[PDB]
């Protein structure tokens, strides 16, 4: 017998580039290496509000004790918009 | 007051009635409804009815095992009180025979009787709408006003003379 | 007493009446029970076993002693 | 009556060499401000707690094999079997996996209880044994299934599923070669109707 | 895994689920009966308060007696406000009364002395075989039912009588020190505050109301089927409702 | 026996101390006594609705403390009457051959009296006969015939050649697990004879009387109540207009049956279903009170009994307690002597074994009385005496040699104090003002 | 809803039919009719 | 045999309602089953929502689980006493009928057979409230002043007595009730 | 349910409601008259405090005496700034309310 426990996954992909056709964030998930940086078993706190208005929906996230490699990948691309 | 199809207490089949008034009947008195509500609740073994795995009584726990009389009585006495219209349980004679390995208990349950709230769905109506008059009685009077007066006069003539 | 103790442990009935009728002294009449089993001691001589019997009420009653009702009303106090 | 129901494969049972005390408690709370008046809904029920203390010894008096602690314990040399180590190995696995344990007690029976903490120590006194404490709380819990019991469900928005012939291109993986069980029928139709990811 | 193991998995869901149904339905039965009142006789039974124990009929007025009550206490509290003044001192303002709290400790023994049938615990206890009657167990499932159903308890103490008290917590300890008995502690606090004659009723309110969920028009929203009529008095209804009411289309 | 099911569930119905005995006139069974658990069983025995026994049973089973199981006595019938000394539909119910339920109807007293007789003859007339004389007599042939009131103002009056004074010694032989005694005859001779029998056998007598002399001026002693008062008989008498027709004796029994005598439960203000309030004025009620004739009174916003005073004068709840003490003390001592004599160690008058009676008597009767509140205990501040029960036993140096030859122990003494209830309260006050 | 529509043929679950027929029975004998678990009518209708 | 083999006799496991794979339900009517029951001819019956054995009654009449227990008591009591006599006789200190060594049999018998029975639930223990008798096992041994001289020549001890009470299972249950209404 | 219970739930509500009308009313009038003055005598009595105990009547200056008082304590509190003052600036202190407690029987 188990309990009912929570689960989640967070994915980071390539920079988003707007072109001459509708933008789909789905296709930017894969990184140049292929598989994306997935984070599963780390304490995470997030808040995501949504509405029906002009302004976009914005969400906040916090992650504790990330590996140095992942933080390095975000130190780069600080000029760009990662999906 | 829970309505439902009436089950014959003597045979267990539906109570179609006597040969003179054969038909179908609904359980109306609270006593009859509660009787069958307990009967079905005790007769269906736990888990054996599809569409509801939680209904029934777990006989398999006790039957075929060495069990303590006191534990069984608690469960028997607890299933009864699951009905919301049970006032109390009066007496309980639980006895067990070791030779035949049989167990047999006795007890009674007390339940009150309620009202019918509405008769719209059952048979009759309680009002007494009036009856239209007959012939020219309405526009010209009625003869009964004469008959009653004549009878009153006759009975008064009867009263005064001693008898 | 040993058989009674075993039976009481098995079933649950532990309460039995206890009465002591003293001679030229106070008496007792209440309901008692067995508290503690004594200790055997097999030695050269014949031993002694002391049973502790606990009692519900332990007020001693003059009963047999006469001339007590009159004496009780004689005491003054305020 | 119910201890004998436990087998050695599904309904595992645990018995301690001795249990000293066990306590059961429930809690409720109510508004601390005068109510407006009947407004008897101003109360809530908390989860009941259960705790007890026990001991496991190198010199057991009863070694009934039905106990899962004594699965493969030697009959004549209990101390070489290292029973206290057997109990701890069992205890951590039950707590770590978050099993919904069932407690059989003197008076009542409790179900859907999870372990939140336990303690083990080996003091100078009572050597060759370990004192154990446990704490449990209620759990208000609320595929291959019969279609008759099925209910409409949802999965939200979904993307390309798993590393397929198309997801491989996204990650720049090379397409999986097709095993040539048959390459005469599908080939003329597969490329013409389904095309290729490119 | 194996097909046989699926049956074992099914047992867990059923038996575990069936357990809460018995507890949940029983609690639902409480809070539905309003003609039932629970009273606890902490003390005073043998001094004056015997008059109140005779009034209870084992059917709708129930009494809770305990084999022994070690201690009980009663403590009311008040709050006092205070504001500062320019004289480097503090003054006082209105005060408030903080309800009130009551607690007591007791014990239920598996070898009773005074088995009075009028006590609601002793409803089914056997007169001549007490220890097998499971008195200690029989008290937990009745005490727990009272607390988890949020009953308004009335306490009949020797010193005074308290009403409108709600249980907040309780304990049950089968310590090895005594055995064959349960040590019980309880705490309570003061919860200080259709039918009936139209004369006494006053103007009520219900707020905004949507379409009734027990009849048609919801089916059109829930996308369901309208219930066919039972035929009786046909050709009299259908002409009128179809013209005066119409159909949801 | 072979059982074809692992589980067999049957859902069915039906099934000083409680059980009363109603001495009725009938022939529906050969025995002298029968027990019933509901009025339904009596109908199956050919009891016509409205019949005397039926009225008593339905009233007794409707009380708040209804007895578990009533008993019906049988005294032979020779004739029955229907009296029409008052009239307005006068439906009457007749049952013949145990199955023929012919509910005769009549509507509008000689005319109705003769008319009713005519209707009966029109029937099965081949099994019953009727004749008007104001009243109309109905007679059976060897066929069970039951006649009962259905409506109207008439009242049934059964008549028998047998006498109550002789039947009662007969019913007791068959069985004696009954405590209350009630009779149908209600004549002055019959009531008195029943009262005397109840004494020697320790039974409680009950009777409702319609006599108008009950509340006559106190100086006038002509009613039954005066006769019993003179003879110092204990019988819970009362006056009621429904004493006939409805036989309200069951209602009173219905309030005391299911109630242990040791509690000392007074009957002062209890409500009796079925009874009707007493309409006499204040002076009349005072007169009846001096008679020891209790009345059911419609009180402020209600209706309730008044007082459980017997004919002798003592309150009724005392009488039941005194009988209850007699029974339990007698069985308890006997139950102990058997044990000693059945182990070979029979009790002896040795002065070393007699004292044991202190524990035997204090055990079963006395202590059970204290825990139930029946017996008082404590101390008195003005009389300076205590209420504790006392027991005294004689020593071997006082038993006369005559008793030792006969092996009899006499002159044992016991003492008790009874807990009295409350019946009346009278406030007095005076609003004085300061100066 | 589940029969023939403008977009082909659909399929109803069991529970919707059960609720519909139980509502019909409720209408037949008023709101007081019992139709859950212990009713003989329930055992007939579900089967 | 497949339902009883791997089950120690000391548990007193009844065979009433166990399921036997391979067997087929008995199709006879109610009257036929009653007839066979009087014969002590057990039947495998297809029960409400299932199929299971009926009763472990042997031809003589006693329930089967009793018979296995009685045999199991015979075997273990016999080996245990023998296993102790060898030890004494193999140390040179063989047992003697001296009335100072016989009493030791109280511990030997209570040790191996009897206690193992109680811990497994096979043997009852406690007190009876209506018969007023206890269920505790008892053991009685004769003293040297009662053994006839004929036995001493043959070196035989006879007339030892033991007492036991068996724990009976449950087979049938029959409820009875009556819904009386207040008035 | 049945009408017999409706005649019972009313009794449960009526008697319970009557309790507030008793307790709640008494406090209301007790606050509606300020003439009465309560006093308590903790110890003190026999050391000449009888001089004022005899002043108490039975209508206005009600007095309360306990069968025994075991201990009574009196205490006052003050507070000051925890930071060095700028310097005399002796106003950096405040007075709290004095407390009094005792035990009796």
Cα torsion C2, C6, C12, C13: sign = negative
Phi, psi of E19 (to 5 degrees): -65, -45
Helix-helix angle F164-174:F188-201, to 10 degrees? 30
Residue F61 · residue F42 · CB < 8 Å: no
State whether F384 and C21 contact (CB < 8 Å). Answer: no
- What is the distance between the alpha carbons of residues D41 and I54, in angstroms, rounded to a whole number? 54
Considering only CB atoms, which chain E residues are within 8 Å of C11?
129, 131-132
- The rounded radius of gyration (Å) of the Cα atoms in chain F is 27
- What is the distance between the alpha carbons of residues F273 and F60, in angstroms, rounded to a whole number? 9
- What is the distance between the alpha carbons of residues I101 and I97, in angstroms, rounded to a whole number? 13
What is the nearest CA distance from E199 to chain I, expressed in angstroms? 16
Phi, psi of E96 (to 5 degrees): -135, 160
- What is the distance between the alpha carbons of residues C2 and A8, in angstroms, rounded to a whole number? 68
- What is the distance between the alpha carbons of residues D113 and D105, in angstroms, rounded to a whole number? 13
Which of B1, B7, B51 lies closest to G40 in CB terms?
B7
Which residue of D170, D173, D174 to mutate against A (max A Cβ within 10 Å)? Answer: D170
State whether E34 and I20 contact (CB < 8 Å). Answer: no
E contact chains, 3+ CB pairs < 8 A:
B, C, D, F, G, I
What is the nearest CA distance from D188 to chain E, expressed in angstroms? 42
Residue G22 · residue G34 · CB < 8 Å: no
Between the CA atoms of A30, A31, A32 and A35, what dihedral angle is there, to the nearest 10 degrees?
-70
Residues of E41-64 as b/e, b for ≥16 C-beta within 10 angstroms?
Answer: bbbbbeeebeebbeebeeebbbbb
Which of D1, D4, D5 lies closest to B68 in CB terms?
D1
- B110 vs H: CB within 8 A: yes
Eight-class DSSP state of E13: H
State whether H179 and F11 contact (CB < 8 Å). Answer: yes
How many contacts (CB atoms, under 8 Å) link F and H?
43
- B116 vs I: CB within 8 A: no
- What is the distance between the alpha carbons of residues H131 and I25, in angstroms, rounded to a whole number? 64
What Cα–Cα distance (Å) separates residue F196 from each residue in F184, F223, F248, I42?
Answer: 16, 17, 22, 71
F204 - beta bridge partners?
A: F180
Angle subtended at Cα F360 by Cα F358 and Cα F363, rounded to the nearest 5 degrees: 100
- H33 vs F: CB within 8 A: yes
Considering only CB atoms, which chain G residues are within 8 Å of E223?
1
**Could you tell me whether strands H172-181 and F7-12 are parallel, antiparallel, or unpaired per DSSP bridges?**
parallel
Which residues, at least 6 apart from D138, have a Cβ–Cβ distance to it below 8 Å? D47, D48, D110, D112, D113
- What is the distance between the alpha carbons of residues G40 and B12, in angstroms, rounded to a whole number? 11
Alpha helices in F72-187 (DSSP H): 110-121, 164-174
> Nearest chain I Cα to E84, which residue?
I94
Which of E14, E25, E134 lies closest to B47 in CB terms?
E14
Among candidate residues F79, F81, F65, F80, the one with its CA nearest the CA of residue F20: F65
Structure tokens at B46: 């736990």
H contact chains, 3+ CB pairs < 8 A:
B, C, D, F
Considering only CB atoms, which chain E residues are within 8 Å of B45?
none
H122, with CB counted inside 10 A (0-12, 13-18, 19+), is buried
> For chain A, first and last CA: distance in Å?
38
SS3 I10: helix
State whether H11 and D62 contact (CB < 8 Å). Answer: no
- B118 vs G: CB within 8 A: yes
Breaks (C–N over 2.5 Å) after residues, chain F: 15, 88, 108, 123, 133, 140
Kindly report the length of chain G.
Answer: 47
What Cα–Cα distance (Å) separates residue B102 from each residue in B63, E128, H14?
Answer: 10, 23, 14
- What is the distance between the alpha carbons of residues H38 and F186, in angstroms, rounded to a whole number? 61
Which method, experimentally, gave rise to this model? cryo-EM
Residue D51 · residue D115 · CB < 8 Å: no
User: Do chain D and B touch: 3 or more Cβ pairs under 8 angstroms?
Assistant: yes
State whether I8 and E60 contact (CB < 8 Å). Answer: yes
What is the nearest CA distance from D129 to chain A, expressed in angstroms? 30
**Cβ atoms within 10 A of the Cβ of D33, count?**
9
- What is the distance between the alpha carbons of residues E125 and E134, in angstroms, rounded to a whole number? 8
Considering only CB atoms, which chain I residues are within 8 Å of E34?
5, 9, 12
> Nearest chain D Cα to B53, which residue?
D149
Structure tokens at E5: 């193991």
- What is the distance between the alpha carbons of residues C37 and H87, in angstroms, rounded to a whole number? 38
Residue D26 · residue D46 · CB < 8 Å: yes
Report the Cα F144 to chain-centroid distance in Å.
27
Considering only CB atoms, which chain E residues are within 8 Å of B89?
123-124
Among candidate residues H167, H171, H170, H172, the one with its CA nearest the CA of residue H69: H167
State whether G32 and B26 contact (CB < 8 Å). Answer: no
Alpha helices in F136-281 (DSSP H): 164-174, 188-201, 224-231, 249-256
SS3 F304: strand
SS3 H21: coil
State whether E18 and B81 contact (CB < 8 Å). Answer: no
Residue E136 · residue E129 · CB < 8 Å: no
- B37 vs G: CB within 8 A: yes
> Nearest chain E Cα to C9, which residue?
E131
State whether H181 and B112 contact (CB < 8 Å). Answer: yes
Residues of F294-316 as b/e, b for ≥16 C-beta within 10 angstroms?
Answer: bbbbeeeeeeebbbbbbbeeebb
Which of D100, D160, D170 lies closest to A3 in CB terms?
D100
Considering only CB atoms, which chain E residues are within 8 Å of I12?
34-35, 37
Considering only CB atoms, which chain B residues are within 8 Å of I1?
85, 112, 114
Structure tokens at E58: 């084992």
User: Do chain C and A touch: 3 or more Cβ pairs under 8 angstroms?
Assistant: no
SS3 D35: coil
Helix-helix angle F249-256:F52-61, to 10 degrees? 30
Which of H38, H172, H176 lies closest to F3 in CB terms?
H172
Among candidate residues E178, E113, E172, E115, the one with its CA nearest the CA of residue E143: E172
Angle subtended at Cα F247 by Cα F244 and Cα F250, rounded to the nearest 5 degrees: 165
Instruction: Give contacts of E 119-158 with C, CB under 8 A.
Output: 128-132
- What is the distance between the alpha carbons of residues A51 and A57, in angstroms, rounded to a whole number? 7
Which residues, at least 6 apart from H140, have a Cβ–Cβ distance to it below 8 Å? H160, H161
Resolution in A: 12.7
Phi, psi of A11 (to 5 degrees): -125, 145
Among candidate residues I14, D34, I9, the one with its CA nearest the CA of residue E191: D34
State whether B103 and H172 contact (CB < 8 Å). Answer: yes
Q: Based on DSSP, count helices (H) and strands (E) in chain H, helices before strands.
A: 5, 5
Which residues, at least 6 apart from F349, have a Cβ–Cβ distance to it below 8 Å? F396, F399, F404, F407, F409
- D64 vs H: CB within 8 A: yes
Alpha helices in E96-177 (DSSP H): 135-148
Considering only CB atoms, which chain H residues are within 8 Å of F59?
none
Structure tokens at E158: 């020797």
């Amino acid at each position: 017998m188990r309990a009912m426990e929570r689960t989640y996954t967070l994915v980071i992909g390539r920079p988003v580039v707007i072109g001459e056709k509708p933008v789909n964030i789905e296709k930017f998930a894969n990184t140049s290496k292929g598989d994306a940086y997935e984070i599963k078993d780390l304490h995470i706190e997030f808040n995501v509000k949504k509405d029906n208005s002009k302004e976009p929906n914005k969400g906040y996230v916090t992650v504790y004790n990330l590996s140095d490699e992942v933080v390095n990948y975000l130190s780069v691309n600080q000029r760009e918009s990662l999906a | 007051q829970f309505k439902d199809l009436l089950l014959d207490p003597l045979t267990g089949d539906l109570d179609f009635g006597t040969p003179g008034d054969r038909g179908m009947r609904l359980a109306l008195t609270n006593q009859l409804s509660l009787r069958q509500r307990l009967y079905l609740r005790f007769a269906i073994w736990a888990g054996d009815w599809y569409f509801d795995e939680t209904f029934g009584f777990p006989y398999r726990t006790f039957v075929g095992k060495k069990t303590v009389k006191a534990v069984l009585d608690g469960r028997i006495k607890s299933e009864v009180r699951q009905e919301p219209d049970v006032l109390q349980i009066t007496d309980f004679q639980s006895t067990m025979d070791v030779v035949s390995r049989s167990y047999k208990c006795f007890f009674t349950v007390v339940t009150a009787e309620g009202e019918e709230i509405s008769l719209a769905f059952v048979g009759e109506d309680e009002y007494q709408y009036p009856t239209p008059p007959e012939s020219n009685v309405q526009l010209c009077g009625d003869e009964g006003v004469i008959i009653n007066f004549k009878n009153k006069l006759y009975y008064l003539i009867n009263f005064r003379l001693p008898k | 007493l040993a058989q009674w103790q075993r039976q009481a442990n098995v079933t649950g009935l532990i309460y039995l009446p206890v009465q002591v009728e003293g001679s030229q002294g106070l008496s007792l009449n209440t309901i008692g029970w067995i508290q503690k089993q004594p200790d055997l001691s097999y030695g050269t001589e014949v031993g002694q076993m002391d049973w502790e019997i606990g009692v519900l009420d332990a007020w001693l009653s003059p009963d047999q002693i006469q001339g007590i009702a009159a004496g009780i009303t004689g005491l003054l106090g305020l | 009556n119910e201890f004998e129901r436990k087998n050695r494969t599904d309904d595992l049972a645990i018995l301690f060499d001795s249990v000293t005390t066990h306590t059961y408690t429930k809690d409720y709370n109510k508004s601390s401000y005068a109510v407006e008046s009947k407004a008897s809904d101003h109360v809530t029920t908390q989860d009941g707690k259960f705790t007890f203390s026990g001991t496991v010894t190198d010199s057991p008096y009863l070694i009934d094999p039905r106990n899962m602690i004594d699965r493969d314990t030697d009959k004549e040399n209990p101390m070489l079997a290292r029973r206290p180590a057997k109990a701890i190995e069992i205890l951590e696995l039950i707590a770590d996996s978050h099993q919904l344990v069932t407690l059989v007690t003197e008076d009542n029976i409790l179900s859907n209880y999870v372990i939140t903490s336990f303690q083990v120590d080996r003091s100078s006194e009572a050597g060759s044994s370990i004192n154990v404490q446990v704490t449990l709380e209620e759990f208000r819990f609320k595929r291959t299934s019969d279609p008759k019991k099925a209910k409409n469900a949802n999965t939200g928005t979904k993307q390309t599923a798993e590393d397929g012939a198309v997801d491989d291109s996204a990650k720049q993986k090379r397409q999986t070669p097709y095993i040539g069980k048959n390459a005469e029928t599908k080939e003329r139709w597969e490329n013409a109707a389904i095309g290729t990811t490119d | 895994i194996s097909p046989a193991q699926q049956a074992q998995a099914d047992k867990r869901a059923r038996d575990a689920a069936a357990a809460k149904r018995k507890q949940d339905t029983e609690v639902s039965n409480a809070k539905s009966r309003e003609d039932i009142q629970y009273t606890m006789f902490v003390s005073g039974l043998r001094r004056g308060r015997l008059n109140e124990f005779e009034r209870k009929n084992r059917t709708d007025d129930l009494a809770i007696l305990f084999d022994s009550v070690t201690t009980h206490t009663y403590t009311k509290d008040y709050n006092k406000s205070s504001y500062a003044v320019e004289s480097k001192a503090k003054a006082s303002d209105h005060v408030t009364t903080q309800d009130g709290k009551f607690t007591f400790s007791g014990t239920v023994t598996d070898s009773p002395y005074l088995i009075d049938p009028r006590n609601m615990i002793d409803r089914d206890t056997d007169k001549e075989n007490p220890m097998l009657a499971r008195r200690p167990a029989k008290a937990i499932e009745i005490l727990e039912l009272i607390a988890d159903s949020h009953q308004l308890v009335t306490l009949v103490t020797e010193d005074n009588i308290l009403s409108n008290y709600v249980i907040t917590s309780f304990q049950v300890d089968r310590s090895s020190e005594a055995g064959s008995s349960i040590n019980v502690q309880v705490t309570l606090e003061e919860f200080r505050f259709r039918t009936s004659d139209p004369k006494k009723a006053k103007n009520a309110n219900t707020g905004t109301k949507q379409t009734a969920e027990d009849g048609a028009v919801d089916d059109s929203a829930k996308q369901k089927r309208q219930t066919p009529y039972i035929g009786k008095n046909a050709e009299t209804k259908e002409r009128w409702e179809n013209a005066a009411i119409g159909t949801t289309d | 026996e072979y059982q074809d099911k692992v589980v067999d569930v049957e859902v069915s119905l039906g099934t000083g101390f409680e059980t009363p005995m109603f001495l009725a006139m009938h022939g529906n069974f050969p025995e002298r006594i029968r027990f019933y658990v509901s009025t339904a069983g009596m109908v199956a025995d050919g009891f016509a609705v409205g019949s005397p026994a039926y009225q008593f049973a339905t009233n007794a089973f409707a009380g708040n403390f209804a007895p578990q199981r009533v008993a019906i006595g049988r005294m032979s019938i020779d004739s029955s009457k229907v009296d029409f000394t008052g009239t307005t539909e006068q439906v009457v119910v007749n049952i013949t051959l145990n199955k023929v339920v012919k509910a005769v109807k009549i509507n509008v007293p000689a005319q109705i009296a003769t008319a009713l007789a005519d209707a009966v003859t029109a029937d099965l007339t081949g099994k019953a006969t009727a004749v008007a004389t104001t009243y109309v007599t109905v007679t059976a042939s060897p066929n069970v015939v039951s006649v009962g009131k259905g409506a109207g103002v008439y009242k049934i009056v059964n008549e028998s050649s047998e006498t109550v004074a002789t039947v009662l010694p007969s019913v007791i032989a068959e069985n004696h697990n009954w405590y209350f005694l009630a009779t149908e005859a209600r004549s002055d001779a019959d009531i008195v004879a029943a009262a005397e029998f109840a004494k020697a056998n320790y039974k409680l007598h009950i009777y409702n009387s319609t006599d108008v002399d009950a509340y006559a001026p106190e100086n006038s002693a002509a009613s039954v109540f005066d006769t019993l008062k003179s003879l110092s008989y204990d019988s819970l008498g009362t006056s009621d207009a429904g004493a006939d027709v409805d036989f309200t004796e069951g209602s009173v029994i219905g309030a005391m049956a299911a109630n242990d005598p040791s509690y000392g439960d007074s009957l002062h203000l209890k409500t009796m279903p079925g009874m009707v309030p007493f309409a006499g004025s204040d002076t009349q009620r005072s007169n009846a009170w001096s008679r020891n004739a209790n009345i059911y009174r419609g009180l402020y916003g209600g209706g309730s009994y008044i007082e459980g005073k017997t004919s002798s004068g003592q309150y009724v709840d005392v009488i039941r307690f005194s009988h209850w003490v007699k029974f339990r003390m007698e069985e308890s001592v006997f139950a102990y002597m058997k044990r000693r004599s059945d182990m070979g160690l029979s009790m002896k008058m040795s002065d070393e074994d007699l004292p044991v009676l202190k524990s035997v008597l204090m055990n079963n009767p006395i202590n059970i009385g204290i825990r139930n509140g029946g017996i008082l205990t404590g101390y008195d501040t003005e009389n300076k005496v205590s209420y504790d029960p006392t027991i005294i036993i004689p020593k071997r140096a006082n038993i006369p040699t005559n008793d030792l030859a006969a092996r009899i122990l006499r002159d044992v003494k016991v003492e008790l104090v009874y807990n009295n209830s409350l019946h009346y309260v009278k406030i007095r006050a005076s609003v004085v003002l300061d100066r | 809803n589940y029969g023939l529509t403008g977009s082909g043929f659909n399929l109803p679950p069991m529970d919707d039919l059960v609720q519909e027929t139980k509502k019909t029975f409720k209408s037949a004998f008023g709101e007081d009719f019992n139709t859950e678990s212990n009713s003989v009518a329930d055992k007939l209708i579900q089967i």
